[PDB]
Amino acid sequence: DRSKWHIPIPSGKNYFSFGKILFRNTTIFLKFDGEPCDLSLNITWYLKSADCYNEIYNFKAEEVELYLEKLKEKRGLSGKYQTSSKLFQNCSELFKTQTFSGDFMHRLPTAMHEPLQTWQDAPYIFIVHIGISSSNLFTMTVEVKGPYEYLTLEDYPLMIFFMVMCIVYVLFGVLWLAWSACYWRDLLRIQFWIGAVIFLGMLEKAVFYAEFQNIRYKGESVQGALILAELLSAVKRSLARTLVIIVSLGYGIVKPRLGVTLHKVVVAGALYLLFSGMEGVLRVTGAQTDLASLAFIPLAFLDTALCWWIFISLTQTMKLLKLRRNIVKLSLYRHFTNTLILAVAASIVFIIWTTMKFRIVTCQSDWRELWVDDAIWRLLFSMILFVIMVLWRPSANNQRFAFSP
Numbered sequence: 001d002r003s004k005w006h007i008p009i010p011s012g013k014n015y016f017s018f019g020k021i022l023f024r025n026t027t028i029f030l031k032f033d034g035e036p037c038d039l040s041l042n043i044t045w046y047l048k049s050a051d052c053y054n055e056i057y058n059f060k061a062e063e064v065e066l067y068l069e070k071l072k073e074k075r076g077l078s079g080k081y082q083t084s085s086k087l088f089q090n091c092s093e094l095f096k097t098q099t100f101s102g103d104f105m106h107r108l109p110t111a112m113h114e115p116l117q118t119w120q121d122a123p124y125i126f127i128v129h130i131g132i133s134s135s136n137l138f139t140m141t142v143e144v145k146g147p148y149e150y151l152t153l154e155d156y157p158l159m160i161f162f163m164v165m166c167i168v169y170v171l172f173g174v175l176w177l178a179w180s181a182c183y184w185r186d187l188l189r190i191q192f193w194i195g196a197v198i199f200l201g202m203l204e205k206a207v208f209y210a211e212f213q214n215i216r217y218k219g220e221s222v223q224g225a226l227i228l229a230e231l232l233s234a235v236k237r238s239l240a241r242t243l244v245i246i247v248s249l250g251y252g253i254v255k256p257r258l259g260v261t262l263h264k265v266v267v268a269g270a271l272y273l274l275f276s277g278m279e280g281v282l283r284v285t286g287a288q289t290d291l292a293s294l295a296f297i298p299l300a301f302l303d304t305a306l307c308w309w310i311f312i313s314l315t316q317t318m319k320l321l322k323l324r325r326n327i328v329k330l331s332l333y334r335h336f337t338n339t340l341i342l343a344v345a346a347s348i349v350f351i352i353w354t355t356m357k358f359r360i361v362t363c364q365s366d367w368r369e370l371w372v373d374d375a376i377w378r379l380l381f382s383m384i385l386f387v388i389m390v391l392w393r394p395s396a397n398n399q400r401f402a403f404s405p
């Protein structure tokens with residue numbers, strides 16, 4: 001999300017709260033700037049740790065004024081916290097009481113810790129309340145800085161994973177270009193679209209890495225990035241699905257390229273991409289407009305129908321091909337169908353494990369590996385793409401996979 005916040009104090013109830021996972025030994029900086037001052041101020045701040053992620057997930061600021069009393073009777077959730085309050089006559093716009101040269105304030109759950117600092121990597125909730133007693137007047141700048149500049153926890157492993165994915169996709173592109181350049185006398189039209197898929201994946205990974213680098217080094221995310229990356233990912237997935245469907249039917253490999261075969265049938269699968277547009281951009285930009293179930297159900301049903309169609313077409317194509325005594329293409333089709341069935345089994349196992357580990361627990365006691373659900377799918381897609389690349393590689397006699405009328 002963000003690490004730098006600018007807030008006009010005379011707005012609402014003057015409560016500013018945020019809950020997120022933070023590193024150990026991270027500092028929180030508060031600055032105040034604005035017009036000349038004439039009103040008494042009273043600033044109170046709470047910084048609370050979290051035993052499990054649940055209280056950071058269902059934390060709604062709209063009732064935060066109630067939440068404090070839940071933290072006042074010692075009847076809330078377990079976790080140590082620090083509190084402090086200070087009074088200022090007019091504005092105190094040049095003192096650094098919240099910056100340095102403070103004291104050692106004990107935490108309640110004999111601590112003697114630094115005033116405003118994290119003591120262990122964990123989910124933290126920070127709340128600040130300003131009371132003004134005798135139309136913007138001030139401006140509050142809030143920053144968080146740990147061992148890195150602005151890269152909080154839960155984003156470091158994702159950034160490393162995206163870097164590794166960028167390197168892997170660059171290697172894939174280099175290998176494909178080398179193989180293509182080595183054998184250019186006779187290629188296939190199916191061997192040109194795999195380069196397009198690799199290019200789209202490379203662009204998506206580069207966009208993600210650039211966005212993460214900018215958010216780390218500036219503290220503010222780029223608005224038109226995540227949406228573009230999601231759109232590119234959806235386009236790449238739709239292209240891969242349609243290529244697999246067209247290969248499964250034997251269009252151009254077993255049977256001749258009939259006039260209306262892909263027309264009105266294969267192209268109509270492009271609406272799947274539309275559904276892929278309703279779950280990517282919608283999920284990346286938090287809306288919560290009662291569309292999560294509508295974003296997950298039809299995509300799963302469409303994918304199941306596509307898998308059913310692909311398997312039936314593959315069975316029919318293999319049955320037809322075995323009757324004419326063909327051995328070169330039969331082994332390739334058997335390897336292709338084995339890879340597809342293994343991918344389906346791995347995907348179903350992954351989805352069962354993800355649904356049985358994360359969204360079944362009362363509160364997530366293991367929040368460290370909370371990023372795996374956003375990377376296992378990409379890793380599986382990359383592995384399947386590499387296997388398909390190894391299966392369909394240009395060679396000396398690159399014509400065994402032709403129709404040959």
Ligand SMILES: CCCCCCCC/C=C\CCCCCCCC(=O)O[C@@H](COC(=O)CCCCCCCCCCCCCCCCC)COP(=O)(O)OCCN
Binds near residue numbers: 303307308384388
């Ligand atoms: C004996 C009973 C009769 C059996 C007859 C056979 C009927 C079929 C039976 C069972 C089918 C079981 C289907 C289970 C549902 C599928 C999983 C699911 O829910 O679909 C899921 C999982 O999707 C997958 O990850 C894999 C789905 C399988 C796709 C396999 C083919 C394409 C793989 C990509 C390869 C590209 C390589 C292209 C190279 C060029 C090639 C020429 C949808 O997430 P998603 O992904 O959208 O993104 C999630 C983002 N959060």
Ligand SMILES: *[C@@H]1O[C@H](CO)[C@@H](O[C@@H]2O[C@H](CO)[C@@H](O[C@@H]3O[C@H](CO)[C@@H](O)[C@H](O)[C@@H]3O)[C@H](O)[C@H]2NC(C)=O)[C@H](O)[C@H]1NC(C)=O
Binds near residue numbers: 088091
């Ligand atoms: C604004 O707030 C401050 C504290 O929040 C008020 O306290 C005054 O702060 C000054 C700054 O050190 C103290 O020193 C005085 O400064 C004036 C101007 O530089 C100087 O002429 C005096 O000889 C003295 O050194 C001052 O003692 C302190 N006053 C009190 C009663 O504690 C400040 O008064 C507020 N400003 C206004 C205009 O109300």
Ligand SMILES: *[C@@H]1O[C@H](CO)[C@@H](O[C@@H]2O[C@H](CO)[C@@H](O)[C@H](O)[C@H]2NC(C)=O)[C@H](O)[C@H]1NC(C)=O
Binds near residue numbers: 025
């Ligand atoms: C916590 O982080 C701080 C800052 O990253 C470090 O404490 C010292 O910070 C100053 C900078 O003002 C450095 O010059 C010192 O080298 C840092 N270490 C010490 C021992 O002074 C340090 O990384 C961490 N400090 C503790 C006590 O864990």
Ligand SMILES: *[C@@H]1O[C@H](CO)[C@@H](O[C@@H]2O[C@H](CO)[C@@H](O)[C@H](O)[C@H]2NC(C)=O)[C@H](O)[C@H]1NC(C)=O
Binds near residue numbers: 044085087
């Ligand atoms: C500044 O605001 C805090 C609230 O964050 C005030 O703390 C209250 O103090 C009164 C009397 O001391 C009691 O009701 C409680 O101790 C506090 N109430 C809470 C925490 O809800 C503090 O008194 C304020 N400073 C003033 C008025 O000078």
Ligand SMILES: CC(C)CCC[C@@H](C)[C@H]1CC[C@H]2[C@@H]3CC=C4C[C@@H](O)CC[C@]4(C)[C@H]3CC[C@]12C
Binds near residue numbers: 379
């Ligand atoms: C295409 C396939 C083969 C690529 C596989 C890349 C693997 C090796 C990458 C992807 C994600 C990576 C992990 C991402 C995050 C972390 C946390 C860090 O504190 C230690 C390293 C560790 C645990 C990484 C180790 C290497 C890792 C597992």
Ligand SMILES: CC(C)CCC[C@@H](C)[C@H]1CC[C@H]2[C@@H]3CC=C4C[C@@H](O)CC[C@]4(C)[C@H]3CC[C@]12C
Binds near residue numbers: 238243252
């Ligand atoms: C989402 C929408 C806009 C995509 C529409 C593009 C269509 C026309 C593309 C996408 C995939 C393409 C197919 C990919 C693979 C092959 C194999 C080759 O041996 C003959 C051409 C053929 C069969 C292509 C024909 C055109 C095709 C069907």
